[PDB]
Amino acid sequence: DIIIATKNGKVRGMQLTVFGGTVTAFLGIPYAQPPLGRLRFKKPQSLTKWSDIWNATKYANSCCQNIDQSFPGFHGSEMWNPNTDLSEDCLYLNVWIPAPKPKNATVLIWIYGGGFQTGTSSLHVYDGKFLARVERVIVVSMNYRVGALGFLALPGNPEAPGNMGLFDQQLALQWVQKNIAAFGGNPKSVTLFGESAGAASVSLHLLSPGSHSLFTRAILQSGSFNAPWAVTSLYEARNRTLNLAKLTGCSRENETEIIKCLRNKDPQEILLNEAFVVPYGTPLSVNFGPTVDGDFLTDMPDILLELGQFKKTQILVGVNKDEGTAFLVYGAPGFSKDNNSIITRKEFQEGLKIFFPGVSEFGKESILFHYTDWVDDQRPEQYREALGDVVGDYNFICPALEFTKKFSEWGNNAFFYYFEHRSSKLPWPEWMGVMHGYEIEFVFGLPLERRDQYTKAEEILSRSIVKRWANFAKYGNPQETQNNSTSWPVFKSTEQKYLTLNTESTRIMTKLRAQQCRFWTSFFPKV
Amino acid sequence: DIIIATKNGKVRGMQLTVFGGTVTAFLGIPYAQPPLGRLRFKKPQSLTKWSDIWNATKYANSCCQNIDQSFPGFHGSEMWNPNTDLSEDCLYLNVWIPAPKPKNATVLIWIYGGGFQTGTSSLHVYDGKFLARVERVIVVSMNYRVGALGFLALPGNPEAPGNMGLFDQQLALQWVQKNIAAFGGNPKSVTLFGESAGAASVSLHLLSPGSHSLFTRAILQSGSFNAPWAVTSLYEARNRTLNLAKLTGCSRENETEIIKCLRNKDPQEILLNEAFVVPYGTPLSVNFGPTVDGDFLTDMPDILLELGQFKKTQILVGVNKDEGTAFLVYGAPGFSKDNNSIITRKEFQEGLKIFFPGVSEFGKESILFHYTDWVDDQRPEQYREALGDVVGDYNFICPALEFTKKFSEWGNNAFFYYFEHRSSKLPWPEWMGVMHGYEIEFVFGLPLERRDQYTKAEEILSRSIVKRWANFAKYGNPQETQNNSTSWPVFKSTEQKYLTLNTESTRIMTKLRAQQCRFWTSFFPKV
Amino acid sequence: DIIIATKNGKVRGMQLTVFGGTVTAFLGIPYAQPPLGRLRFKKPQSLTKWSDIWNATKYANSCCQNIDQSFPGFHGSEMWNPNTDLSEDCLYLNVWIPAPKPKNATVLIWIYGGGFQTGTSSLHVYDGKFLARVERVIVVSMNYRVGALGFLALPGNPEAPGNMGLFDQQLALQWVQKNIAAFGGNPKSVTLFGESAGAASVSLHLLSPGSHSLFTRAILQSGSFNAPWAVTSLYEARNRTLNLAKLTGCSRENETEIIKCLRNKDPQEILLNEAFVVPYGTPLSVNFGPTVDGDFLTDMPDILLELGQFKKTQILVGVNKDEGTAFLVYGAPGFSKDNNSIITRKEFQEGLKIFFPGVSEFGKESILFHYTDWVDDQRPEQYREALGDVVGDYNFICPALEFTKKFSEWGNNAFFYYFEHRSSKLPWPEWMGVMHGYEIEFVFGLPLERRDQYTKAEEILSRSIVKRWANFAKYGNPQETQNNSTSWPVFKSTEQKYLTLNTESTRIMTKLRAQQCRFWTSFFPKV
């Protein structure tokens, strides 16, 4: 029986055997009042507190969300769908501690992605028991609100202020500050880590003054807030809230009466209509995301970043080799996860339409131009590959590299990686390569489980990554110091060194995607 | 109804519609005991406090002052005359806040000019509603005492210690520190800004130890305390107080009995005699201004500046292209706002007499010499232009550039601008060019009001200036980061870069007025 | 009668005449509960406190330990054996203060070596009365637990957590912080100094967060924790504890029941079996030493050192010219303290077997190769000398120089010495040279006693060393500033300057043992 006294009550955990050792898991501890009834759309409220023992022995409810049903029965898509009941009653977190109870362990706090529309902390690829066992860190993860229920904005109005899901995450950070020493953690050594929208969230906490004192450093996997999908403009946010109203029969005259009406809808009706609040979506549509609310976010974040207004600390940032490929099969014509997706020039042009819906003809031709000067054989896969690169470079890689340059210009150490290993168990086809999301299971140490049908070389890669992330969280320096490893140099504007992560040889390289990012970063924004 | 509880009582504001939005204005909140009866000539005393609601719904009384009556019915002069009743009962301030109430907004505090003899915070060109609306800053402005009633000095004697108007401003700064969080402002992010005597005041607050903790940074428009008009010497101050006495029938034997007598005069009689306390005035006469009082100002300010004794923070400093022209029509012979003011050599010589009344013949010939080596056509406008430059370079531009070099030599970032746009609505004639005072309406965002008959290009210039001032106040760096703008480089001794502000093209230039300032700065002071 | 009131009670000291002066000695003051019965194998517990006067007038019990009986009646070995009764009741310390009582004296705290298996603070060569007399420092020394009784580890289990002897030392450091001002010492000026395992201990206190605030700087004589003998791996520690159990009839099923059984054994039975817990020992066997316990030591120390996680302060580090020789006569074939120990190639090879028991054949040939390329005469002493160097360079000199480079790379000043004087009274034979342990009596100032049959030149060397150590403790800079002495330069990576200590001439030299350490440091660890 392991019981820990927290500020709000007693919690009971469960013991787990991992690699001949023990980890104690506390799954589903509440960290805020359930955001129901009058509380829907509002900032999370602090927990009232319980007498008696809260059993933290199973994953809690995942937040209300639309689900991926493009490939029923297929593991590659369905591994990302929630594996616990959906409910508005979803503001819970999880804690994995080493056994025996550590004395003053560093804390790793995971923030999942899902485009701010989906996701949950109970997914198998986010299981923190391996990190606790192997590195003796404490790992914490929280569910936070998504879609309209997390990000509906009527800016300035506390009935629906925007950014509720970000405040959900922030309230979980406070929970760690107030309670983690009781689990043997050191609230003075907290590193946030997150992937995609989770990484964009970590980047916004670096910018939010209310987050400054709730963490020590940060890790950003495939995302950052200056990614084109990551921040909804004030204008878009109001169009979308008003469209949503219109669709659910809630258009009113008094804004506060819009929200009161929206609070009477059942969750399904809000969810069903989320997809249509936008005139034309792309596969990366973020219908309801972060906004400049005047509260979590005090100014346009591009301006904070440019002018050096953010927490000064170390960062670790990276991307995967084929970020853009996952998205091509959710709409681009000629693509299929069940064939080699050889597409023609014309199909390419149509795919740009699908990914760049509000862009002038000239804007689109300029992309075609940058990406189709072939070298040079007339390889049939030319167009298929160019479309993946386009989608990945614009949406993930160039914004990651740009955030890292700008962050590092104000004096702090930064480290940048390029992940190029394709999982031997990947259920998606070969042409899709080193996909978006498929470093996560390396970071969490799944391939350390020998029973799991990953190769020996994958075991070793995961062990080295887990060590580098852990050393980064504890010491600010993502080195593996014992096994004659390649030193990971700081990323500086000017040299722009990065480290490649793969099974064969680890390399120091310079100026990732230099020609492509010059296009996305200095020209495309004018278009 | 918007009511805010302050340390001294409740205040009610009014709502205003600005650009489809709302700003709440609190106009005329008192911030000190009325300086009447026994309190005339003394430091401002702290506010006793009220029960009930103070209605802050109209501009308060402007301080006692002489008025400009050189051009009755002419908007160019009369825009500067007070637009509320004059009264010794004038120590009030104004607050504009964005709607809805901000969370922790930066604060901009305006200090008006008027040679320390005139001015008021209720003028149309100082209206803070546009800054609040557009940039979501809070804007504060205060009336402070002017002329003998603000600056009469009998140094060392608390019945009339000097610098009362500066202490008035300082007491308004304290009011912001104590009360602004209640209006949603951040007392830890206060930038002072001021023009001409208002800018000279901002520069003296940088030097005053009692002001150190009442603000974060500073903006100086066309003025700084080392301008020749800006600080009255101890000797001049005593001559002037004694002349004033003599004129009002108050000469006594006991200094304290001089002041007691002066306290029995009605305000008009003090004002009527102010102009004559000086043997010969110039159009820029500052009969009663700042002094070294041993209190606000602990030593001669030239010495503090030289030896690095001032608040260390960032500054933004600038001047207009034709600072000196406004003054030529208040006395220089051959000048008129109603003709082209072509003057001869002889008239030039006479104008130097008018502007440089106590200067040796050699002193005057040396100016003539520096400014009349023509290049070269015998253009009729030669003498008219040289006189404007003379007046502007000596009184405004060279002291601004010298304060910026000296300030920046001790390590802090400084930014310097040269404003060269002439308002399309300027009621003064063409020959007077880009006049002193006529950047103010750009800084306050008047041309953002489309109804107002300014051009499209003026709208855009004002929007860019308002952004740069706002970014300076919030972040210390006067950049406009979103619209491919020219970066404003720091001003360093050695390179001396500055930014030009105009409608056509923004430029980085070096060493403004280099030859002229070498004359004013290193030679003229010996003369 | 000298009585001093401490936090736990009154202590009485005794007066001693030293060099025509007086020192007050407090010998045997307790500083923790006696670690007996249920307390055996546990962290030291805080002292309960006494009413009445504790007589601190004789050395206390030395801790339980095996004794050196290789040369009964021989002073060279027996000078190192305890000179007070052995007892588990041994947690006492000693204080020497100058007379009269100083006002705010620097404190020197000695930690003895003995491989963590042996040693005691009452040995004649550790007598602090000369340092107090000559330099007016206060000197403190503590007994701490050794062998299984100090270092038995079942990691994670507080019944036997590991590192008890290190916690013993740490608890004595706290005692100095709480009580030394009462003896006239300055708890803000504490330097630790230690030799061999004592120096390794000082190096681990630099790494232990709980030691950070208990001292100012550090001195390391012939030892540092990255020496191959100095830290037991987690794996070895468990093998050894389980072997010990097996040998004493204490194997159980419940680990806690192993320790309860071990607590019923008499000390002799634990000691008798210590030597056998290891399959094959070397003469430098550390059967029970420091471990990564998660408490004193939060990670593998090689990793802390590499990544800059340690107290930032100055260090003084050094070694003796023939560190390895003492060990050759405890097992290497052909060696004797009673003859010239000329050995053959074959005997060399056998000696490598004795010193490098778990090393591959290739590992051993590589040592033979590095150390036997003769220059060049076939001198008979070739093999005898190479074996001493091998043992000394691997175990002492190269780890000392490597700790100093790594420590200094993070910004702090470091000073490195090479001691090359052989005591004129050394009872060991000539071939053994400048032996391990035989700088101690110079540091403690024994040769300042003229009655003692050391030479005049030895008197002067000791006086200069004592001054340099004292200046290091007080001022962080080990200079002798009055007698035209050679300046001791800081040791920097890159130049690697060190100071030689000898009777003839003091020299600045570079890159000690450069070729040998490249072998031990960059190649041998792979083997």
Ligand SMILES: *[C@@H]1O[C@H](CO[C@H]2O[C@@H](C)[C@@H](O)[C@@H](O)[C@@H]2O)[C@@H](O[C@@H]2O[C@H](CO)[C@@H](O)[C@H](O)[C@H]2NC(C)=O)[C@H](O)[C@H]1NC(C)=O
């Ligand atoms: C690869 O598959 C795509 C995807 O569309 C198809 O999925 C296939 C696996 C196929 O068996 C069929 O069931 C389904 O329509 C093919 O794209 C389709 O191309 C066909 C031409 O016959 C058109 O009818 C469709 O417009 C088009 N569908 C979409 C959604 O774009 C594609 O031709 C095929 N490519 C290969 C084998 O290289």
Ligand SMILES: *[C@@H]1O[C@H](CO[C@H]2O[C@@H](C)[C@@H](O)[C@@H](O)[C@@H]2O)[C@@H](O[C@@H]2O[C@H](CO)[C@@H](O)[C@H](O)[C@H]2NC(C)=O)[C@H](O)[C@H]1NC(C)=O
């Ligand atoms: C520009 O005007 C000045 C200003 O003085 C005059 O104002 C004029 C608009 C004019 O109509 C008249 O009412 C008024 O006197 C002229 O300066 C004046 O020059 C005249 C010469 O006839 C003299 O009588 C005055 O001394 C002088 N006045 C002052 C105050 O200096 C000036 O000549 C004229 N210049 C032009 C047209 O270029």
Ligand SMILES: *[C@@H]1O[C@H](CO[C@H]2O[C@@H](C)[C@@H](O)[C@@H](O)[C@@H]2O)[C@@H](O[C@@H]2O[C@H](CO)[C@@H](O)[C@H](O)[C@H]2NC(C)=O)[C@H](O)[C@H]1NC(C)=O
């Ligand atoms: C130096 O002495 C060693 C040590 O062993 C011996 O100690 C001597 C002082 C000697 O008198 C004797 O009592 C004792 O055995 C000698 O090593 C020994 O060599 C002899 C060869 O006769 C062998 O019998 C032993 O194996 C060996 N002993 C050990 C422990 O190694 C060594 O030969 C001698 N060397 C000289 C004089 O150069």
Ligand SMILES: *[C@H]1O[C@H](CO[C@H]2O[C@@H](C)[C@@H](O)[C@@H](O)[C@@H]2O)[C@@H](O[C@@H]2O[C@H](CO)[C@@H](O)[C@H](O)[C@H]2NC(C)=O)[C@H](O)[C@H]1NC(C)=O
């Ligand atoms: C947001 O404002 C309008 C909203 O119109 C929308 O009605 C909603 C309730 C929703 O169902 C949504 O699908 C629909 O668009 C947008 O107007 C669009 O623009 C086209 C222009 O050709 C018009 O035909 C429609 O009004 C509408 N489009 C479609 C396909 O029906 C408006 O464009 C949008 N703002 C943006 C994109 O910035």
Ligand SMILES: *[C@H]1O[C@H](CO[C@H]2O[C@@H](C)[C@@H](O)[C@@H](O)[C@@H]2O)[C@@H](O[C@@H]2O[C@H](CO)[C@@H](O)[C@H](O)[C@H]2NC(C)=O)[C@H](O)[C@H]1NC(C)=O
């Ligand atoms: C200040 O001290 C005297 C004051 O004399 C003045 O009487 C005042 C009440 C006032 O009305 C003022 O206009 C008048 O000047 C100054 O003396 C001046 O110097 C000239 C020298 O030729 C004398 O004729 C007068 O006393 C007076 N001037 C005039 C035009 O009347 C004194 O110069 C001044 N101090 C300065 C300028 O530094």
Ligand SMILES: *[C@H]1O[C@H](CO[C@H]2O[C@@H](C)[C@@H](O)[C@@H](O)[C@@H]2O)[C@@H](O[C@@H]2O[C@H](CO)[C@@H](O)[C@H](O)[C@H]2NC(C)=O)[C@H](O)[C@H]1NC(C)=O
């Ligand atoms: C630690 O684990 C075993 C323990 O075996 C030991 O039994 C103990 C109680 C003790 O007396 C000790 O001397 C003895 O070794 C080690 O096994 C050794 O390896 C050899 C391999 O040839 C075997 O013959 C024995 O089991 C044992 N050696 C001897 C000489 O008896 C084991 O190797 C050790 N772990 C290490 C060295 O890492």
Ligand SMILES: *[C@@H]1O[C@H](CO)[C@@H](O)[C@H](O)[C@H]1NC(C)=O
């Ligand atoms: C928590 O679990 C234990 C049984 O495993 C039980 O005793 C306790 O009552 C539980 N609490 C519940 C079901 O609320």
Ligand SMILES: *[C@@H]1O[C@H](CO)[C@@H](O)[C@H](O)[C@H]1NC(C)=O
């Ligand atoms: C944990 O470490 C911090 C510094 O990072 C320290 O201040 C704190 O007191 C430690 N807490 C423990 C050992 O409980």
Ligand SMILES: *[C@@H]1O[C@H](CO)[C@@H](O)[C@H](O)[C@H]1NC(C)=O
């Ligand atoms: C709208 O209704 C709300 C909520 O009942 C009320 O508080 C608010 O004053 C109203 N505003 C307007 C403009 O009607």
Ligand SMILES: *[C@@H]1O[C@H](CO)[C@@H](O)[C@H](O)[C@H]1NC(C)=O
């Ligand atoms: C280091 O050593 C061995 C390989 O020789 C391996 O088992 C272990 O995983 C490595 N450690 C890390 C952190 O990569």
Ligand SMILES: *[C@@H]1O[C@H](CO)[C@@H](O)[C@H](O)[C@H]1NC(C)=O
């Ligand atoms: C302030 O204004 C309101 C009316 O608009 C009034 O109720 C209140 O009495 C006023 N206070 C005065 C006139 O003192």
Ligand SMILES: *[C@@H]1O[C@H](CO)[C@@H](O)[C@H](O)[C@H]1NC(C)=O
């Ligand atoms: C406003 O910002 C400051 C730092 O500039 C901070 O210390 C303060 O507490 C903030 N106040 C709020 C959000 O009310």
Ligand SMILES: *[C@@H]1O[C@H](CO)[C@@H](O)[C@H](O)[C@H]1NC(C)=O
């Ligand atoms: C002058 O009168 C004042 C005010 O009544 C008095 O306090 C002061 O002592 C007097 N001083 C002289 C020198 O007469």
Ligand SMILES: *[C@@H]1O[C@H](CO)[C@@H](O)[C@H](O)[C@H]1NC(C)=O
């Ligand atoms: C930036 O964008 C547009 C012009 O393309 C304009 O409306 C806006 O005023 C500009 N913003 C600023 C701060 O100058």
Ligand SMILES: *[C@@H]1O[C@H](CO)[C@@H](O)[C@H](O)[C@H]1NC(C)=O
């Ligand atoms: C300590 O020593 C003195 C005698 O020298 C004595 O008076 C006192 O009783 C002693 N304490 C003991 C023996 O406990």
Ligand SMILES: *[C@@H]1O[C@H](CO)[C@@H](O)[C@H](O)[C@H]1NC(C)=O
């Ligand atoms: C001893 O020196 C320290 C500084 O090293 C000082 O703060 C302390 O108060 C001094 N104590 C005395 C003289 O008792």
